[PDB]
C-alpha cells in the first residue's frame, strides 16, 4: 500500500513563480530515484525526466531554461519550481519513483550501452490550470 | 575535387557522410551525389 | 489510433517507427480517471502479478516496427496503450508515440 499527497493553489497567475511539492511513503529518498510526468489533458503522456540527489540533476533537454528541482533530506520532500509560466502549461502532473534496467550490445569498454528507466508505480497527481 | 563535407546527420566516431560534386555518366551535367568516407 | 475488437479475439498494436537499431520497449497503459501502471518491463521480460499471457517482440529487429499481440480480449483491456521506444541511435525521446485506444464491444 503506497500513497502519497499533493498541493497546489488550482489557479495560478501568468508569469508567476510557481512552485509545487510532492512528499514520499516510507521509501527514503537517497536510496531512491523519482520522476516527473506531465500529461496534456486527452494527449500522449509527456516525460519531465529524474532528478537525484549528489550529481544526478538532469533536466528535460528540450526546456532547460526554467526547471528547477530541489530536494529536503530533513522533510523527505522534493520540490518542482516553474518560473515564467505560460497558458500552455495547463496539465496534470505525476511525481513517481522509477527503477533501472541495462543492456549491453557491444564492446565492455567502449560504452555500448544506455540505461533504460520505467516507472513501477505512478503518483496521484494534482491539476495545474491558468486562467486571468 | 574538395567536397562541401559536413557532419553526420545515427552513425558517428569517424563517420562523415559527404558529398561530391561528381561528374556524372553522360560526360556532363554534373551532378552533386554523396557517399560516406 | 481507434482499434476495434471484439471480445475474445486476437488483436494487433503497432507503435514505434522503422527499426535503425536495437530497441528496449516498454509498455504503459493509462486507465480513465486512474492512475497508469506497467505491463512489461523490457523487451520480453515481465513483472510479477501479472500470468505470461502478455507477449512482444525481441529489440534484435533491423528495420521491422514493433507490435504488440494481444489475444482473447476480456472487459478489462479498456484502456488506452501507449510505447515507448529506446533507440540506441537517437537520443532518448521523452514524448511517447501514438496512444492506441482498446475499445470492447
Ligand atoms: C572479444 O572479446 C570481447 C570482450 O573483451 C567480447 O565482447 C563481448 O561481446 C558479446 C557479444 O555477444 C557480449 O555478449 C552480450 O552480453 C550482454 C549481457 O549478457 C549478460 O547475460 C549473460 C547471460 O544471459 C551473461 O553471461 C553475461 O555476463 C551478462 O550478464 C547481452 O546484451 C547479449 O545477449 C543478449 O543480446 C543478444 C544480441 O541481441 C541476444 O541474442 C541474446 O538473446 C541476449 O538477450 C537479448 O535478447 C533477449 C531476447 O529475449 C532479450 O530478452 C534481451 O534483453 C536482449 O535483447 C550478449 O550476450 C559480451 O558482453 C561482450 N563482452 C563483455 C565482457 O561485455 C567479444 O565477443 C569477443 N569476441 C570477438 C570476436 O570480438
Ligand atoms: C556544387 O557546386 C556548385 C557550384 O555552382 C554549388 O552551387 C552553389 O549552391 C549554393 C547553395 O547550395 C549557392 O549559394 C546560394 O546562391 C545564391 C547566390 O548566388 C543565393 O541563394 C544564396 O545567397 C547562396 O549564396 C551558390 O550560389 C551555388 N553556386 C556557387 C558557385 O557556389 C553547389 O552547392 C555544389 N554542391 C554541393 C553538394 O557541394
Ligand atoms: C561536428 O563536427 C565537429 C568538427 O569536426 C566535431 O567535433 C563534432 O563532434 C561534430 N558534432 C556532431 C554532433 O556530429
Known amino acids: 500500500q503506497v500513497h502519497l499527497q499533493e498541493s497546489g493553489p488550482g489557479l495560478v497567475k501568468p508569469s508567476e513563480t510557481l512552485s509545487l511539492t510532492c512528499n514520499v511513503s516510507?521509501?527514503?529518498?537517497?536510496?531512491?530515484?523519482w520522476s516527473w510526468i506531465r500529461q496534456p489533458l486527452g494527449k500522449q503522456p509527456e516525460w519531465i525526466g529524474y532528478?537525484?540527489?549528489?550529481?544526478?540533476?538532469n533536466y528535460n533537454p528540450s526546456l532547460k531554461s526554467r526547471v528547477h528541482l530541489s530536494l529536503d533530506k530533513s522533510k523527505n520532500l522534493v520540490s518542482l519550481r516553474l518560473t515564467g509560466v505560460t497558458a500552455a502549461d495547463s496539465a496534470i502532473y505525476y511525481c513517481?519513483?522509477?527503477?533501472?534496467?541495462?543492456?549491453?550490445?557491444?564492446?565492455?569498454?567502449?560504452?555500448?550501452?544506455?540505461?533504460?528507466?520505467?516507472?513501477?508505480?505512478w503518483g496521484k497527481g494534482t491539476s495545474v490550470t491558468v486562467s486571468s | 575535387v574538395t567536397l562541401h563535407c559536413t557532419n553526420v546527420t545515427t552513425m558517428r566516431e569517424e563517420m562523415k557522410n559527404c558529398s561530391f560534386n561528381t561528374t556524372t555518366v553522360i560526360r556532363d551535367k554534373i551532378q552533386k551525389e554523396y557517399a560516406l568516407f | 489510433t481507434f482499434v476495434s475488437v471484439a471480445p475474445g479475439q486476437t488483436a494487433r498494436i503497432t507503435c514505434g517507427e522503422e527499426s535503425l537499431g536495437s530497441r528496449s520497449v516498454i509498455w504503459y497503459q493509462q486507465r480513465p480517471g486512474q492512475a497508469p501502471s506497467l505491463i512489461i518491463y523490457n523487451n520480453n521480460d515481465r513483472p510479477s502479478g501479472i500470468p505470461d499471457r502478455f507477449s512482444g517482440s525481441p529489440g534484435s529487429t533491423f528495420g521491422t516496427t514493433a507490435t504488440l499481440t494481444i489475444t482473447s480480449v476480456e472487459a478489462g483491456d479498456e484502456a488506452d496503450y501507449y510505447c515507448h521506444i529506446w533507440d540506441s541511435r537517437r537520443p532518448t525521446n521523452w514524448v511517447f508515440g501514438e496512444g492506441t485506444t482498446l475499445i470492447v464491444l
Open positions: 513517481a519513483t522509477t527503477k533501472h534496467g541495462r543492456r549491453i550490445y557491444g564492446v565492455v569498454a567502449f560504452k555500448e550501452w544506455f540505461t533504460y528507466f520505467y516507472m513501477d508505480v
Open positions: 532528478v537525484h540527489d549528489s550529481g544526478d540533476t
Open positions: 516510507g521509501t527514503l529518498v537517497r536510496d531512491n530515484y
